[PDB]
Amino acid sequence: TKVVLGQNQYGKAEVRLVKVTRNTARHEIQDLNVTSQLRGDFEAAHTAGDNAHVVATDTQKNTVYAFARDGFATTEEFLLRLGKHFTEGFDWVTGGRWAAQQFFWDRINDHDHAFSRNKSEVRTAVLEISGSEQAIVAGIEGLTVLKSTGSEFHGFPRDKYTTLQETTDRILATDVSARWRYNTVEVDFDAVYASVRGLLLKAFAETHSLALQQTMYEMGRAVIETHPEIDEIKMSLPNKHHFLVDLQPFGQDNPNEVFYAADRPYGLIEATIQREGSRADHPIWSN
Amino acid sequence: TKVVLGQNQYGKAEVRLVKVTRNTARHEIQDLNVTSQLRGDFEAAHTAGDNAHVVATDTQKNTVYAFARDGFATTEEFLLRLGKHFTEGFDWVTGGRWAAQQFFWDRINDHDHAFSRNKSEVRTAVLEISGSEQAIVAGIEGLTVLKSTGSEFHGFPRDKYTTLQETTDRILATDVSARWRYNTVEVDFDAVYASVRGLLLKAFAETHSLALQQTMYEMGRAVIETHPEIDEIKMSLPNKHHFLVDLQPFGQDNPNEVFYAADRPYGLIEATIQREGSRADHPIWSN
Amino acid sequence: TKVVLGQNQYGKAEVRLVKVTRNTARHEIQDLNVTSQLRGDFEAAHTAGDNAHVVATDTQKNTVYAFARDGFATTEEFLLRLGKHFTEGFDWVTGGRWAAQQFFWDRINDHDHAFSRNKSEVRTAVLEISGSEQAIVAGIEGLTVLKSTGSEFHGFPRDKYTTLQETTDRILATDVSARWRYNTVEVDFDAVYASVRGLLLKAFAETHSLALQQTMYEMGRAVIETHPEIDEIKMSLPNKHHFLVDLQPFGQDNPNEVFYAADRPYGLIEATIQREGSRADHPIWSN
Amino acid sequence: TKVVLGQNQYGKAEVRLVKVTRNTARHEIQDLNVTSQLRGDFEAAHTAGDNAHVVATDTQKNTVYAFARDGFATTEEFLLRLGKHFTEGFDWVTGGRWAAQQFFWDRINDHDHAFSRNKSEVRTAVLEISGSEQAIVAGIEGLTVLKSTGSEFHGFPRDKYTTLQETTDRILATDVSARWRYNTVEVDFDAVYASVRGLLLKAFAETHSLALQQTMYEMGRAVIETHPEIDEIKMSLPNKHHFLVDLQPFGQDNPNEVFYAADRPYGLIEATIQREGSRADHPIWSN
Ligand SMILES: O=c1[nH]c(=O)c2nn[nH]c2[nH]1
Ligand SMILES: O=c1[nH]c(=O)c2nn[nH]c2[nH]1
Ligand SMILES: O=c1[nH]c(=O)c2nn[nH]c2[nH]1
Ligand SMILES: O=c1[nH]c(=O)c2nn[nH]c2[nH]1
């Protein structure tokens, strides 16, 4: 009977931006995939078609390119600017969500204006403003890692549906998808992203894994213990199975050398490693 | 300082299952992409690498195929069975999240056992168990729609970043991604899905649009009003932009006929339509 | 040593076009992804950087939309026009390749101007011009089909690496990708596309398959036998394996009901079925 | 009336192999996606369903793994071993096409058995045997490059559909996709791959481009002049358009700094650069 408009947001998603810094002959490249969405009072827009409060998504796109013209130090900075502009620029706009993907480029032979893309990982950033409160989550995705040894899995329960054999030597392969929430905007965004990345990789490589979960925990622990500006870090790590091929039918053995890299299905292990006493479920995670 | 383990879950993702029904010569097909993840006490598995609590993801995969053997009336029914099995079968497992994509097949000229894949839409379902509670959210995705007219957009604010021209006749195209949460598990799942799908299309096509937000609202309102077992319905609708090409430079006009369908960027209108006073904060929306 | 500029072609690829026909209240939609490349004397363009001969890819893009304004009866007739224009309007352009994908849309409850996409198959067409010569290849792709029975595979050689067991009852699933070359341009393009599709689907469904090879041969046989204007039909059919899951370790049998649809690897069976005597290697298959 | 079986081939596509070298503590990783297809006399398999000649695609897959056990020095060497084994092992198999994608891994902090995937490019190899002849084409793809200046495009034709503005300074970005054919199987496959990669990158960056066509020519020329074992190199380069946004409506100028990276459409520039006197159109290019 009584229908009501609940949570809502809207804007321009995936605005591809490339900003070249060419004040000197040594060109700089900044590449982002930006998404802007606003939150506020849009009751009439949905219920009556009254667009008085609707700052056009096209306009939000236009603002991204306009602000880019002034350049930005980091991705978070750029997002911070867009957020303040929209929330303060309009009364009915109480907040919103601004995200971006940062694509890495390397110079070709240290060239002044020639680069090639580094597709090994994608950096992300999300900004969420709610009234007077702000929150930034930085992250990394698409970084694939693998250990040829130094990994085992055994001691798990065995029901009538269990056929997996225990092991003390296997391959551990996953894609690093991690996201950490800063407990303050005053952060050296580039330095911390670099550090977090290094910590994750090191923990993955040096930890003798008894389970992907254990490895993930150690990766998460290293970050929290190292950075006071981070309250928590979430990770979604798939266990990309590399099955040891059975060659015995052909009278050949396989000493952990020949594997079949299966696509699907795959284990999916996820968890949140936080600083004891930090907020439990921040809104930024709701998206 | 003190690193703690927060929310966490694990299982086997994307188990592709095809169940054929052939007790009679008239074969039936059920094609699913199943995901199983468990929640409970996995404290030791993460901090000590003690897997006594770790029901193998491989075992979960096996349980899916074993259960499929007995058949299932609906996708939601199949998931409820998997959920009940793991929560009740292990004391440290107090809940989980079981999801699936259902793919549709049509008979080739009414043949008894030959079919063709209907890729126009993908059906979804996600079951979340929290102790005694079992929440189910069904959905639809990949259903692309378009109105060649009967859509306008005007009356929006115009700041210094606004260039968009108002219009009373444009194309409105989007990908229908809708998801709805049932307030009860006693639902005729297949019939409700078919009904919701029809209400969504009808509303999109018959609503004279003043904005994508108004269309979406009318789409959601229709569903909430028709089905009492539905508390809320969320939609994420991209505004797939079809730009009327400027042919004047070629000496021709363009009476809303020739369009350029842009990939990115795109508007992204999202909202939750619901029964007044319902729990628009359910955890299942956290994933 | 000496370097020689060999085969070459250039143009604008993937120009997304949507043509709405709204003369009556009942609108019609034509959706295409068009690619236009030119061939001719571009020696100086590559070797010297002289663009005198380079009809801009941008210009080619504009021509596609300008021509769209006048409407077109079929996708093939649109390409024919595009090709004649470029070869005839420039002395240095001696030919080229014009391709297009055609996406289908269905009305939402027989509505005058509201539709939903039918993604179950994508229609294709390729036109190649070489001086006075002109050839057209029409095709279909992305059409997934599956037989739950009426498929066998036995009698193959058992070499020292063969573990596959003979079977007289299995699932046969594939993606139908078929392309046929017309011996003349005077064809009811739409009627023939409808027919071929119907013949392929029928041949796939009704043929008691002893091998994907046999099935594919019959599919192409029906096409050549039914249409005199077609000289040959090429098919590329993956054998999308659906493995009958072994449930015996769980104390269950599996009467051809529970399957695991694997992603990779997959059998890839391909072949050309042609009219006796027709050409062996038309340049149009060279791309 | 009379239908005949023309060209044909079949086998197992996309066999994911990971070969770990660990006879020492310093592990090595070889990661490939292998496709195996046979050519010969399969007339009966297609026409009558007689599989006596059909070496199962499943067997071909098994062979890939059995062979991997022994190890291989290079992707091309491994392909040659497969090609030779099948053609010689069966009388009715007179040739085939073996293809492979090689994915690269980097040690994590020079660790012995922990790596991270380098996704900035994918290496390719195609071996085609025809009787006593065996041709090998190696390649690179997925390598994205960009010049922020040092590129222009002017002097092109202008007709009624020409609107592109001439420029003396623009962004030149593309996806480097290249394939070169060897004139002999006696090559240091890995050294040449690296050499060619560097030459393409160097020619792209340093050449002051007057058109993508010219840049590509210089890239091909450098490779041919440098390596005697290469008869020709083919390149397929899209012109990834980065449009200089019009910021004047916002009260700003845009001195070649803020760009919009469009997805589609895109220019597609392709050409073959070969050693003078070399073969015109080798069959391997037809696949
Ligand atoms: O690390 C792992 N965690 C799991 O939960 C699991 N299940 N199977 N293999 C596994 N590996
Ligand atoms: O339907 C629309 N809603 C919006 O909010 C919008 N902004 N630009 N175009 C738009 N179209
Ligand atoms: O480099 C280019 N080559 C072309 O042929 C072209 N056409 N438009 N822009 C172009 N740029
Ligand atoms: O129909 C088939 N053809 C083949 O070539 C094959 N190989 N394995 N199974 C097969 N089935």
CSV table of C-alpha atoms and ligand atoms in Angstrom, one decimal, chain C residues 153 164 170 211-213 239 241 269, chain D residues 10 54 56-58, ligand 4:
chain,number,residue,atom,x,y,z
C,153,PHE,CA,31.6,-40.6,-29.5
C,164,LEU,CA,39.0,-40.9,-23.0
C,170,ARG,CA,26.6,-37.7,-23.8
C,211,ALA,CA,30.8,-36.7,-33.5
C,212,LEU,CA,30.8,-32.9,-33.5
C,213,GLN,CA,32.5,-33.3,-36.9
C,239,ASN,CA,32.9,-28.7,-28.0
C,241,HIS,CA,32.5,-30.0,-22.4
C,269,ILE,CA,36.2,-28.6,-34.5
D,10,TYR,CA,40.2,-29.9,-35.1
D,54,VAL,CA,40.0,-39.0,-34.9
D,56,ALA,CA,40.7,-37.3,-29.5
D,57,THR,CA,41.0,-33.7,-28.6
D,58,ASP,CA,41.2,-35.1,-25.1
E,4,LIG,O1,32.8,-35.2,-31.3
E,4,LIG,C1,33.9,-35.2,-30.8
E,4,LIG,N1,35.0,-35.0,-31.6
E,4,LIG,C2,36.3,-35.0,-31.3
E,4,LIG,O2,37.2,-34.7,-32.1
E,4,LIG,C3,36.5,-35.3,-29.9
E,4,LIG,N2,37.6,-35.5,-29.1
E,4,LIG,N3,37.1,-35.8,-27.9
E,4,LIG,N4,35.8,-35.9,-27.8
E,4,LIG,C4,35.4,-35.6,-29.1
E,4,LIG,N5,34.2,-35.6,-29.5
